[PDB]
Ligand binder design. Sequence first.
Ligand code: REA
Length: 176
Amino acid sequence: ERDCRVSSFRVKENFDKARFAGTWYAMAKKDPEGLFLQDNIVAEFSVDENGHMSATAKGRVRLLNNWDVCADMVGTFTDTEDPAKFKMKYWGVASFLQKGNDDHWIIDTDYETFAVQYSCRLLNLDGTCADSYSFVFARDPSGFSPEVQKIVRQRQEELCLARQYRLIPHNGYCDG
Ligand SMILES: CC1=C(/C=C/C(C)=C/C=C/C(C)=C/C(=O)O)C(C)(C)CCC1
């Protein structure tokens, strides 16, 4: 019954960028295909005088050859017609880091405790997502109340991504 068209997905009513600024800890994630951040992920959002939003993020990345590395990444966001939908150009501090362009949607947030993000990097012909990713972020590393977990579990259902998210460890590897 429930529609999986990325076009139909709901997003944050009247997104407020400055209000999202600060440190966010990823608690759980739904990885995309290929190399992705492993764990110990922490994002840090900024918004300039102009309204230009930017972010930095640390995360452990396992390189093909098995070395583990603490990837220091960079992201710049571009506004769209949808205040909660942005275009994100990212790159790493080190040259060997994945560089790219991806959609960045703020599905839901309360700005103070949690946030569900999402990106489809490929649309199937039908209109659903063939390559997605999603971050569940928390204001406090400790996580959230069974109350908010309810909400999140709900946003996840709506993104056609329930029962396929994983918990993210934080063990200070990239120093925390
Ligand atoms: C920029 C950006 C994001 C994507 C980061 C990616 C995609 C990092 C990939 C790192 C790799 C791919 C490192 C490596 O493999 O060296 C996320 C949504 C958290 C949202 C805001 C900041």
